Amino acid sequence: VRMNVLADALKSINNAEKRGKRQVLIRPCSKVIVRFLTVMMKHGYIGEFEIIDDHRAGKIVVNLTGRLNKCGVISPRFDVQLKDLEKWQNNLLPSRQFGFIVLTTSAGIMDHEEARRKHTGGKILGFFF
Amino acid sequence: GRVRTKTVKKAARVIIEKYYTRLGNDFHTNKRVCEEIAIIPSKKLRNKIAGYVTHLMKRIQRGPVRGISIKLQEEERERRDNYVPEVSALDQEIIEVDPDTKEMLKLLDFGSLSNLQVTQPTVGM
């Protein structure tokens, strides 16, 4: 039924970007989703956001810039050992000028660019550009 | 079979539209007026043109035509456009319509001048 709620969040983000609306409602909340949007915010692709704290499970409302072509989730959360990123680079990123990958390292939810410097690797959550 | 050809009706409307003035309601006169104001290569074409010209004259003398109007009909339609009396752009300068627009003019900053009163049941359509 309800599984991998990161996908449920990011397909709503995708439909709202393709439609052209301003702000999205997402009924589940995860620390995964919050740190994912933190990476997207720090790299500037979204705007400011706000978490309605339900006692049960909150709801995230995100102001949208309008730059987001495509965000999404790789489904089974594959492992990625280092010196195996370049497969995912050529397979997922639209170019060698932009695009980002969200790894899950032991030292936090990191970025494709911070991961190669921190020299960790780990599991893939998703991608956005 | 008087279904008359496109070129005949075309030349006839051009003839009446240029020279409404010379043409009268008499067929044999209008026939010879057509040879004065036009160049018609044949006598059958003269007769066809003059016949439909007289049938158009019995419409234009009757009323205005959707095809083309003469200068007199132009001036009369311009008169009917710009006729201005001083009557009813404004009524008596209180008009009563609605309690909902009374609420509206309570909202918007105005003087709440005078009465507005209907109350209705709920049989809309």
């Binding site: - | 070129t7 036009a38 290569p41 074409l45």
Partner: protein, 55 residues
């Protein structure tokens, strides 16, 4: 109005028949084209005058 030209051409393939027909333009005076207009193409004169008020 229509000047018919029908000629033969002998080649190694055989024969080629050519037909050329040219509609002459209506010029009212001169040797260029014919002097009778088309019975469909009817010319009129442009409007006459303007001023006509009483005195």
């Amino acid at each position: 109005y229509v000047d018919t030209a029908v000629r033969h051409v002998l080649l190694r393939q055989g024969v080629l028949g050519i037909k050329v027909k040219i509609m002459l333009p209506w010029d009212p005076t001169g040797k260029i084209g014919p002097k009778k207009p088309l019975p469909d193409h009817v010319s009129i004169v442009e409007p006459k005058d303007e001023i006509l008020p009483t005195t």
